[PDB]
Symmetry: C3
Subunit: 145 residues, 3 copies
């Protein structure tokens, strides 16, 4: 095909900047288009089978409902590895849910599915600041064949 056609709202192309393998799992640090950084955690088995290595090109795939949005950390530090700061670009409201797209510094867009109550409570609006919070274990990797 011309590309990979997958339902996930967020499919990023990038280059591995680091590969950190343990005996069970491996942490893959990816440098995205705009300069944004995204970490993924995959099994050791996958790191070997996909032939991962620093410097190789990969795709990182994150479904919309897996992305949490945060506006005020209030000093808290979280266990999720990926905290990407950006500005709200688009909100489309559904019945219970809504789709929010943030623009990150560098130009990458990330899409989150949250409740319409969350949009309301967070005060989201075009231009508002917010961070996308993604567990590295919720990032699926792809490698070209």
């Amino acid at each position: 095909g011309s590309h990979m056609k997958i339902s996930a709202r967020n499919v990023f192309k990038g280059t591995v900047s680091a590969l950190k393998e343990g005996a069970v799992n491996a942490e893959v640090d990816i440098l995205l288009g705009g300069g944004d950084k995204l970490a993924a955690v995959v099994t050791l088995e996958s790191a070997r089978s996909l032939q991962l290595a620093a410097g190789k090109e990969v795709v990182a795939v994150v479904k919309a409902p897996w992305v949490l949005l945060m506006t005020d950390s209030s000093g808290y530090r979280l266990s999720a590895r990926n905290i990407l700061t950006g500005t709200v670009k688009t909100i489309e409201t559904g019945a219970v849910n809504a789709e929010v797209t943030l623009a990150l510094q560098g130009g990458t867009e990330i899409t989150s599915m949250v409740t319409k109550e969350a949009v309301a409570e967070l005060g989201l609006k075009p231009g508002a600041s917010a961070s996308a919070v993604i567990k590295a274990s919720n990032v699926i990797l792809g490698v070209p064949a």
Copy 2:
């Protein structure tokens, strides 16, 4: 800020009652407000960096779509660590999805996003009994700075 403002429908404050670290991951057992217990699984790296320890205060964050609802286990035992029993308090139906809030014994409320077909099939209604089923690996932790 006055608090942490995050999209997740479920943000619980609690105290760590146990910390169980292995070489890869760590199990964090949290005692919530009402007496409810919730287990989270985080990387070893996070357990060290966040300075986790039994007796310390934490926040546990669970997105709505990550909570499954069960009414009849029919004798089955599941691999998910958190099975919290409660009574239905609120259901708001959307187009395909719905938001269900359960009250747990002690007073904590938990919110789940499920399909409207699931609500129908389960026979959910105010006062019905049901359990929230949450994998401990789907619980994100926060620690005050």
Copy 3:
């Protein structure tokens, strides 16, 4: 009860064809009804407590929003363990989301919740080919008591 009543759209009965335990986690390979294969990853603790073994009957539970749909891999290989190919049987559109059901070869049906934009972009329609992509870590297991 007559069965297990749980919200997840996908609850499959099967027999364990392989059990692969490591020091942290265990991979459980399940042979489903129609001949379809599904892999689950659970803690070692659960594999021991549930008394898992090859040849035993289990239930595998996957929430709808945890299933990604793919139509053209374009040569890419992914880190998710489960790539199940099938044909679209039913789509019900909501406001922002939609529910897609695929029929797999053998007769098993799998349901995915994706955005209505994904349905549009993928060109989904009754009879179209598509694969369900599920991380083995997003499969919850149940064992009869």
